[PDB]
Design an enzyme around this catalytic site. Structure first.
Site, PDB file in Angstrom:
ATOM      1  N   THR A 108     -10.156   0.993  10.372  1.00 57.07           N
ATOM      2  CA  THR A 108     -10.640   0.027   9.392  1.00 57.07           C
ATOM      3  C   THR A 108      -9.553  -0.952   8.975  1.00 57.07           C
ATOM      4  O   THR A 108      -9.841  -1.956   8.319  1.00 57.07           O
ATOM      5  CB  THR A 108     -11.210   0.737   8.176  1.00 57.07           C
ATOM      6  OG1 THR A 108     -11.815  -0.232   7.317  1.00 57.07           O
ATOM      7  CG2 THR A 108     -10.149   1.490   7.436  1.00 57.07           C
TER       8      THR A 108
ATOM      9  N   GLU B 124       0.925 -24.891  -1.930  1.00 55.68           N
ATOM     10  CA  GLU B 124       2.131 -25.615  -1.553  1.00 55.68           C
ATOM     11  C   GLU B 124       3.035 -24.777  -0.655  1.00 55.68           C
ATOM     12  O   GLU B 124       4.148 -25.199  -0.323  1.00 55.68           O
ATOM     13  CB  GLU B 124       2.868 -26.077  -2.803  1.00 55.68           C
ATOM     14  CG  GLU B 124       2.123 -27.140  -3.560  1.00 55.68           C
ATOM     15  CD  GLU B 124       2.672 -27.387  -4.938  1.00 55.68           C
ATOM     16  OE1 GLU B 124       1.869 -27.590  -5.869  1.00 55.68           O
ATOM     17  OE2 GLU B 124       3.905 -27.386  -5.089  1.00 55.68           O
TER      18      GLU B 124
ATOM     19  N   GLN C  96      -6.744   3.239   4.377  1.00 53.74           N
ATOM     20  CA  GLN C  96      -5.960   4.293   3.740  1.00 53.74           C
ATOM     21  C   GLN C  96      -4.511   3.892   3.603  1.00 53.74           C
ATOM     22  O   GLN C  96      -3.883   4.245   2.613  1.00 53.74           O
ATOM     23  CB  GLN C  96      -6.103   5.610   4.526  1.00 53.74           C
ATOM     24  CG  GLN C  96      -5.234   6.818   4.107  1.00 53.74           C
ATOM     25  CD  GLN C  96      -4.026   7.062   5.011  1.00 53.74           C
ATOM     26  OE1 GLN C  96      -4.026   6.690   6.177  1.00 53.74           O
ATOM     27  NE2 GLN C  96      -3.003   7.711   4.473  1.00 53.74           N
TER      28      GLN C  96
ATOM     29  N   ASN D 251       6.475   0.961   0.527  1.00 49.98           N
ATOM     30  CA  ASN D 251       5.532   0.186  -0.253  1.00 49.98           C
ATOM     31  C   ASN D 251       6.116  -0.296  -1.564  1.00 49.98           C
ATOM     32  O   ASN D 251       5.521  -1.171  -2.202  1.00 49.98           O
ATOM     33  CB  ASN D 251       4.285   1.000  -0.544  1.00 49.98           C
ATOM     34  CG  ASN D 251       3.792   1.701   0.651  1.00 49.98           C
ATOM     35  OD1 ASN D 251       4.054   1.284   1.769  1.00 49.98           O
ATOM     36  ND2 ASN D 251       3.083   2.791   0.443  1.00 49.98           N
TER      37      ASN D 251
HETATM   38  N1  LIG Z   1       4.005   0.133   5.634  1.00 54.20           N
HETATM   39  C1  LIG Z   1       3.209   1.187   5.643  1.00 54.20           C
HETATM   40  N2  LIG Z   1       2.508   1.492   6.779  1.00 54.20           N
HETATM   41  C2  LIG Z   1       1.698   2.562   6.810  1.00 54.20           C
HETATM   42  C3  LIG Z   1       1.553   3.349   5.698  1.00 54.20           C
HETATM   43  N3  LIG Z   1       0.699   4.336   5.998  1.00 54.20           N
HETATM   44  C4  LIG Z   1       0.291   4.184   7.273  1.00 54.20           C
HETATM   45  N4  LIG Z   1       0.921   3.096   7.793  1.00 54.20           N
HETATM   46  C5  LIG Z   1       0.740   2.548   9.133  1.00 54.20           C
HETATM   47  O1  LIG Z   1      -0.645   2.508   9.371  1.00 54.20           O
HETATM   48  C6  LIG Z   1      -0.907   2.578  10.750  1.00 54.20           C
HETATM   49  C7  LIG Z   1      -1.972   3.637  11.021  1.00 54.20           C
HETATM   50  O2  LIG Z   1      -3.280   3.171  10.782  1.00 54.20           O
HETATM   51  P1  LIG Z   1      -3.929   3.250   9.317  1.00 54.20           P
HETATM   52  O3  LIG Z   1      -3.589   2.013   8.560  1.00 54.20           O
HETATM   53  O4  LIG Z   1      -3.438   4.473   8.595  1.00 54.20           O
HETATM   54  O5  LIG Z   1      -5.518   3.266   9.524  1.00 54.20           O
HETATM   55  P2  LIG Z   1      -6.468   3.115   8.253  1.00 54.20           P
HETATM   56  O6  LIG Z   1      -6.448   1.730   7.680  1.00 54.20           O
HETATM   57  O7  LIG Z   1      -5.939   4.088   7.281  1.00 54.20           O
HETATM   58  O8  LIG Z   1      -7.939   3.577   8.670  1.00 54.20           O
HETATM   59  P3  LIG Z   1      -8.166   4.838   9.628  1.00 54.20           P
HETATM   60  O9  LIG Z   1      -7.748   4.461  11.019  1.00 54.20           O
HETATM   61  O10 LIG Z   1      -9.623   5.210   9.686  1.00 54.20           O
HETATM   62  O11 LIG Z   1      -7.347   5.982   9.088  1.00 54.20           O
HETATM   63  C8  LIG Z   1       0.429   2.909  11.375  1.00 54.20           C
HETATM   64  O12 LIG Z   1       0.987   1.697  11.811  1.00 54.20           O
HETATM   65  C9  LIG Z   1       1.256   3.426  10.231  1.00 54.20           C
HETATM   66  O13 LIG Z   1       2.608   3.148  10.462  1.00 54.20           O
HETATM   67  C10 LIG Z   1       2.247   3.041   4.556  1.00 54.20           C
HETATM   68  O14 LIG Z   1       2.120   3.752   3.570  1.00 54.20           O
HETATM   69  N5  LIG Z   1       3.077   1.956   4.521  1.00 54.20           N
HETATM   70 MG   LIG Z   2      -5.396   5.227   8.895  1.00 54.64          MG
END
Ligand SMILES: Nc1nc2c(ncn2[C@@H]2O[C@H](COP(=O)(O)OP(=O)(O)OP(=O)(O)O)[C@@H](O)[C@H]2O)c(=O)[nH]1
Ligand SMILES: [Mg+2]
Ligand SMILES: Nc1nc2c(ncn2[C@@H]2O[C@H](COP(=O)(O)OP(=O)(O)O)[C@@H](O)[C@H]2O)c(=O)[nH]1
EC number: 3.6.5.-
Lengths: 219, 436, 184, 440, 36, 64
Positions: free
Chosen positions: D145, D254, D11, D228
């Site tokens: 995930t 490279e 997500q 982002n």
């Molecule tokens: N740079 C950045 N980091 C994000 C963003 N959204 C969430 N995060 C980071 O994502 C982490 C939380 O885990 P998620 O990546 O949301 O987990 P997931 O891949 O969505 O899968 P689930 O755990 O099932 O929700 C934290 O470190 C948040 O700071 C984003 O839009 N940009």
């Molecule tokens: Mg998440």
């Protein structure tokens, strides 16, 4: 001077005051037991042998065919005592009741959890030596006590849980108290592997549920 | 695609989930008769978490309502939104428990639970992927509490890989209607430690104290208190129903707050609660959600967190907010007060945001904070219960109903179990043998 | 540095019966403890390291982090108990092209990875008082195309019982060993 | 024929994608619906889009992406948000229930109910390729995930595709700010499986991007949109040598030969120097010398990791715009004259330089400005040794009393797979000591 | 002592990047010559 | 200018079976193993590294 989640203690200078205390690791007040109330009245067939080798419990009846349904829940009832004579018939009686006889210890262990746990709730550091010595001796000197105690770690293990890691941190310093068993986090360990060694299958789960840092040895 | 089935228990259970469904129906825009007279598409994207479709354009909840009195729960149809329920879901006994948990466990509750489970299986095989079920009850009476123990203890045995939320009103210390409160209160919790792994413990006198000192009502009723509890019941599981920047479902918080498999009795709150005269004057920023939501006045249970150590903290936020400010307030509080928060969890707070606020509010937040000041509720329940039980006060309307007397004696040490566990994890140290 | 040491047929850098055994080794204990008694069959005291974690409690061999013990002998033999819990022991080497390479044997790995500096292998303790005789100069010849020069550190982490840590210039049968080095 | 598939896991990986796939449709002339306008050209043709997009007969451009997910309500923002018809429906593949912030749920419990379908779409995107350079993955090391299925994503790709340049971008969880309580259990178990299987790996904290949006762009209260947007500019410049030809050229191969000295050291750390807002961008002339200065500067780095506490091993610069090669070499040699900027004594050369010609494109609604020239740095410093010596203790703060371990041990694994995971950070931490100490 | 503004930020500015959190501009560049 | 070799750091260690017969005829190296069955792969590049020796006792073992 501060107190918590207020408009104070959000300042750039403050000293905060946390939680007061917790009732763990600290010794509890005791209570009058029932071994006192039945020893003065006089039903016990026990006297005190005074040998040259030490002190032993004198017996005026059979040790084997005693009425253990009355007595076995009445010496754990007096295990919680620290004054000199009263702890002695309690501790020394329980060993001699257990190593004699057999085929009756199975239906009496349902009725022993109240004055096993209340011996252990006291947070004193010589009963926890003594009561955790007999829990090794309880499991050994019988047959098939193991499979009857497997739903019975939920009630007696929370007080092994807080004190399982009690050891000595001395680098090359020889110790001299390995003669007696004072050191409790030793004695909590080999009692828990004595529970898993007996008890048959399906009891390796039931300590990992309760003392969470456990590692189920003996595959 | 993650459905959930609502099951409400007893008179107070049916009084709580009659205003909770007003809350859900107004936040999804649907009228008293059932139809969608609403203006969005986010109100019909994920409405299948709760509702269910009929022929002709009607939505009904997946609500099954249990009661042991016949005339109680057909006073719930006579409310405003009380005719939206399908009438097969209503299940009711004939002779009530009589405010006794033993009559609600062995004798009169054991013949209603078969029909209750029939309706439960019908509402629970209908789904796409069933996330879980909900329970709502109080631990003072017997129709709510005895049945609420029996049905969870025989519903987890056939639906075990599911999530199972519990709302529990624990009885209050200093306001106490029912005289036989402590027997029910100390006999229900050993079922709710084994059977749910998820329980929110809310209390009537703490619900009174907010309505006296914060909302400043001249005359609060049980409708206003139910309106308090349902505005937390909704805000906990918004994130299933609405999109998020950073979202978190109920499976996300249940894995996160509970460190060991018993430690699941939580204390809610709600952030922008404001008196009617002081509503327009007061701003709504994220500092003014955090200071009011962490505040020991504006808590929703009787435990004061200053008498112990926080084990883990939640926060679920609703509005249009900025992740830097949301993620710096938690750090600010946690390192500015750092003798409460537990040592062997280095950052203790979990946070989620959702885009769609409650109706008429620009921002809101919700608290679920696992603290170790829950030892005190168990201690005072044990004290009043053993005080009554030492000289055997009212034993015979529980003991002539097929009981042994030592079930009580084991149901006090299944409570002294959790007292000493919460005293262990509160005084545990980052480096061992620092305190012996 | 064990540089002007003669480095004869045997050499030993720890023993248990001692006025001060852990004299050269640097002890570091965290959520753990150390003492000096454990004795199943042999009536002789034994060092102890155990804690809940297998990585923080350890005793490194050079007390100086910089100083190195240069030891040429092709084996490495320790007399260490079994417990049915974890253990890691580490001894890093030096090979012919002057590179500092590693060899870790712990209870709980599935398969051996081979990498430039790191090669982690399984290990299986026997039920009794095992003593392990470790092969240094074949393991640096199978995993890399090198030949052996010296081994520079030894560091042992959690959950074992230690007596007589030593090295060997070859392998002995147990009847060939001198009586003070034997198992019993 | 230079082509690369894109994978956006999680997500948080979808949030990265649509800030980085709006970016590409402005860099070319592609509209929301995927076809360029009949009138109103944007540039000279020549199939510059062909690294990312692909062509039907009728004149449509559909990306080479696959947005894999377990949370079915974040991709339905993409199934009805403005880029509705840019994709097939079959590239956006959502599960039924999440890993629920358990890597062990995503690895063992849930993740193979959606691993046959991913590796069937992956073959259809990558058999119409001819000269496939590699892949990209985008994730974050907090969630389920993000941590878990990405491990099964790449260990499957290790044996299905052999040796392709499977690139990894990431988010490394910050020192202090942390959305989670189960956070350090994931990152010590997923770094263990992105050692063997990733060819290069990019670390960036969310906490550091908060610092430069607050201070350089001077927007108080940023959002996850403005985090982002910046990550897209960095991804844009890596592949800018592949789409628009320049004075020097550096493909993906490279970098790999040129940055990373050993097979465990593939953690560069990025920055992008003119992160300047438009109220104070157009005032100051912005030479290629003084944007080389701000790449090195420790406040502006993108991980809470500064090279003043270690020593650089190799650097790699990516200039764009109105940049001439004589003025690049005038500022490369200035950095080598100062004793504060410590280069290691097995790299006397030190730098790798690429010059492209196309200025970076600008998004509407975004927050930077339209600047002629910019620069991106990919260094490799010794100071990554503080990015596990903090994570180890913060993991060991919990694990020595076995907090939260029952939510992974019960869900399909065993207790020893945590203690084979801290050992590799007790091996990686000594490697960054080993290759940093000076030869005497 | 400083030649440029690569070195004015990188003299003894006394800001650990790993340890300072949520800082303004002026509290990054703080040499030892302002403290004493 | 010279630098120390591998021969110097292998004689102080002591793998070689070299010992010096201080003869009244002169100087000759005693051999405590047969010269045929020595490992010449292990030895012949190593005495050649002692060829760069000027100070007395190690340059003699190289040459002789
Ligand atoms: N740079 C950045 N980091 C994000 C963003 N959204 C969430 N995060 C980071 O994502 C982490 C939380 O885990 P998620 O990546 O949301 O987990 P997931 O891949 O969505 O899968 P689930 O755990 O099932 O929700 C934290 O470190 C948040 O700071 C984003 O839009 N940009
Ligand atoms: Mg998440
Ligand atoms: N917290 C809360 N308690 C309520 C409400 N309405 C009724 N009660 C409680 O209902 C209890 C008596 O009803 P109850 O015992 O639940 O009836 P039963 O479920 O059939 O046993 C009292 O303790 C009240 O505190 C409400 O809106 N909120």
């Amino acid at each position: 001077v501060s107190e918590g989640f207020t408009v104070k203690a959000m300042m750039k200078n403050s000293v905060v005051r946390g939680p007061p205390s917790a009732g763990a690791f600290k010794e509890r007040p005791t209570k009058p037991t029932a071994f006192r109330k039945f020893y003065e009245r006089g039903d016990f067939p026990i006297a005190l042998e005074h040998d040259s080798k030490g002190n032993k419990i004198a017996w005026k009846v059979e040790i084997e065919k005693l009425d253990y349904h009355h007595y076995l829940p009445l010496f754990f009832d007096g295990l919680c005592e620290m004054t000199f004579p009263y702890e002695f018939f309690a501790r020394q009686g329980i060993h001699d009741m257990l190593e004699h006889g057999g085929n009756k210890i199975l239906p009496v262990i349902p009725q022993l959890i109240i004055p096993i746990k209340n011996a252990l709730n006291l947070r004193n550091r010589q009963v926890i030596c003594v009561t955790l010595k007999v829990l090794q001796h309880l499991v050994v000197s019988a047959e098939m006590v193991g499979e009857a105690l497997v739903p019975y770690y939920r009630q007696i293990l929370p007080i092994l849980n807080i004190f399982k890691n009690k050891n000595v941190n001395s680098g090359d310093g020889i110790d001299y108290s390995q003669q007696k068993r004072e050191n409790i986090g030793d004695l909590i360990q080999e009692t828990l592997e004595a529970f898993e060694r007996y008890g048959g299958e399906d009891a390796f789960i039931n300590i990992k549920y309760m003392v969470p840092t456990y590692e189920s040895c003996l595959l | 695609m993650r459905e959930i089935v609502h099951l409400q228990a007893g008179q107070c259970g049916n009084q709580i989930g009659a205003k909770f469904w007003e809350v859900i129906s107004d936040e999804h825009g649907i009228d008293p008769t059932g139809t969608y007279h609403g203006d969005s598409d986010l109100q019909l994207e994920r409405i299948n978490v709760y509702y269910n479709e009929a022929t002709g354009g009607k939505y009904v909840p997946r609500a099954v309502l249990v009661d042991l009195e016949p005339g109680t729960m057909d006073s719930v149809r006579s409310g405003p939104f009380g005719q939206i329920f399908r009438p097969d879901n209503f299940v009711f006994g004939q002779s009530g428990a009589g405010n006794n948990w033993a009559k609600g466990h062995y004798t009169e509750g054991a013949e209603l639970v078969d029909s209750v489970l029939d309706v439960v299986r019908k509402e629970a095989e209908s789904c796409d992927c069933l996330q879980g079920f909900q329970l709502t009850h109080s631990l003072g009476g017997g129709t709510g509490s005895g049945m609420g123990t029996l049905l969870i203890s025989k519903i987890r045995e056939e639906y075990p890989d599911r999530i199972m939320n519990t709302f529990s009103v624990v009885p209050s210390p200093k306001v106490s209607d029912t005289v036989v409160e402590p027997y029910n209160a100390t006999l229900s919790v050993h079922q709710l430690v084994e059977n749910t792994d998820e329980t929110y413990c809310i209390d009537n006198e703490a619900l009174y104290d907010i309505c006296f000192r914060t909302l400043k009502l001249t005359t609060p009723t049980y409708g206003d208190l139910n309106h308090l509890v349902s505005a937390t019941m909704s805000g906990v599981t918004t994130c299933l129903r609405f999109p998020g920047q950073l979202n978190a479902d109920l499976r996300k918080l249940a894995v996160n707050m509970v460190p060991f498999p018993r430690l699941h009795f939580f204390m809610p709150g709600f952030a922008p609660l404001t008196s009617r005269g002081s509503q327009q004057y007061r701003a709504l920023t994220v500092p003014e959600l955090t200071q009011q939501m962490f505040d020991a006045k504006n808590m929703m249970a009787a435990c004061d967190p200053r008498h112990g150590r926080y084990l883990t903290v939640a926060a679920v936020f609703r509005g249009r907010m900025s992740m830097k400010e949301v993620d710096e307030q938690m750090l600010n509080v946690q390192n500015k007060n750092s003798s409460y928060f537990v040592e062997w969890i280095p950052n203790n707070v979990k946070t989620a945001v959702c885009d769609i606020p409650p109706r008429g509010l620009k921002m809101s937040a919700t608290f679920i904070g696992n603290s170790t000041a829950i030892q005190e509720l168990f201690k005072r329940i044990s004290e009043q219960f053993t005080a009554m039980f030492r000289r055997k006060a009212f034993l015979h309307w529980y003991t002539g109903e097929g009981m042994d007397e030592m079930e009580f004696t084991e149901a006090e040490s299944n409570m002294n179990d959790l007292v000493s566990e919460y005293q262990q994890y509160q005084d545990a140290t980052a480096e061992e043998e620092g305190e012996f | 540095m064990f540089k002007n040491t003669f480095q004869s047929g045997f050499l030993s850098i720890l023993y248990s019966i001692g006025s001060k055994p852990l004299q050269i080794w640097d002890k570091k204990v965290r959520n753990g403890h150390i003492k000096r008694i454990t004795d199943n069959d042999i009536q002789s005291l034994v060092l102890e390291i155990e804690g809940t974690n297998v990585s923080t409690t350890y005793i490194t061999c050079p007390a100086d982090p910089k100083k190195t013990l240069g030891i040429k002998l092709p084996f490495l033999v320790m007399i260490i108990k079994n417990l049915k819990k974890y253990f890691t022991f580490e001894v890093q080497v030096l090979d012919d092209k002057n590179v500092r390479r590693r060899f870790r044997a712990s209870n709980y790995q599935s398969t051996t990875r081979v990498k430039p500096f790191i090669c982690t292998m399984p290990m299986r303790l026997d039920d009794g008082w095992n003593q392990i005789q470790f092969n240094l100069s074949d393991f640096t010849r199978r995993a890399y195309g090198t030949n052996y020069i010296e081994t520079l550190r030894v560091q042992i982490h959690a959950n074992c019982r230690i007596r007589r840590v030593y090295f060997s210039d070859r392998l002995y049968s147990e009847d060939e060993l001198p009586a003070e080095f034997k198992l019993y | 024929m230079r082509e690369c598939i894109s994978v956006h896991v999680g997500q948080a990986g979808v949030q990265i994608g649509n800030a980085c796939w709006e970016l590409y449709c402005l860099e070319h002339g592609i509209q929301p619906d995927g076809q360029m306008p009949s009138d109103k050209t944007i540039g000279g043709g020549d199939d510059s889009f062909n690294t990312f997009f692909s062509e039907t007969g009728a004149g449509k451009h559909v990306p080479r992406a696959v947005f894999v997910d377990l949370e079915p309500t974040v991709i339905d923002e993409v199934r009805t948000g403005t880029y509705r018809q840019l994709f097939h429906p079959e590239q956006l593949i959502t599960g039924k229930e999440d890993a629920a912030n358990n890597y062990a749920r995503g690895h063992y419990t849930i993740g193979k109910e959606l691993i046959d379908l991913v590796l069937d779409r992956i073959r259809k995107l990558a058999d119409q390729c001819t000269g496939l350079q590699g892949f990209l993955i985008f994730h974050s090391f907090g969630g389920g995930t993000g941590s878990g299925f990405t491990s099964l994503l790449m260990e499957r790709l290790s044996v299905d595709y052999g040796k392709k340049s499977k690139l990894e971008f990431s988010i490394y969880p910050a020192p202090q700010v942390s959305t989670a309580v189960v956070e350090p259990y994931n990152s010590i178990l997923t770094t263990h499986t992105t050692l063997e299987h990733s060819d290069c790996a990019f670390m960036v904290d969310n906490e550091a991007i908060y610092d430069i949006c607050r201070r350089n762009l001077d927007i108080e209260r940023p959002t996850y949109t403005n985090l982002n947007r910046l990550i897209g500019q960095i991804v844009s410049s890596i592949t800018a040598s592949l789409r628009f030809d320049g004075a020097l050229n550096v493909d993906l191969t490279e970098f790999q030969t040129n940055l990373v000295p050993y097979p465990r050291i593939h953690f560069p750390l990025a920055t992008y120097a003119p992160v300047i807002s438009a109220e104070k961008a157009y005032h100051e002339q912005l030479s290629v010398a003084e944007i080389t200065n701000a790449c090195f500067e420790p406040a502006n780095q993108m991980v809470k990791c500064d090279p003043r506490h270690g020593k650089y091993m190799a650097c790699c610069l990516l200039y764009r715009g109105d940049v001439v090669p004589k003025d690049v070499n005038a500022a490369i040699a200035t950095i080598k004259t100062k004793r504060t900027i410590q280069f290691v004594d097995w790299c006397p050369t030190g730098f790798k330089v690429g010059i492209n010609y196309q200025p970076p494109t600008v998004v509407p609604g975004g927050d930077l400005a339209k600047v002629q020239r910019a620069v991106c740095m990919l260094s490799n410093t010794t100071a990554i040794a503080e990015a596990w010596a903090r994570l180890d203790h913060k993991f060991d703060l919990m694990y020595a009393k076995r907090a939260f371990v029952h939510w992974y041990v019960g869900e399909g694994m065993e207790e020893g797979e945590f203690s084979e995971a801290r050992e590799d950070m007790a091996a990686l931490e000594k490697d960054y000591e080993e290759v940093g100490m000076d030869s005497v | 002592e400083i030649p440029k503004d690569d070195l004015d930020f990188r003299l003894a500015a006394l800001y650990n990047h790993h340890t300072g959190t949520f800082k303004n501009k002026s509290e990054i560049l703080t040499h030892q010559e302002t403290i004493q």
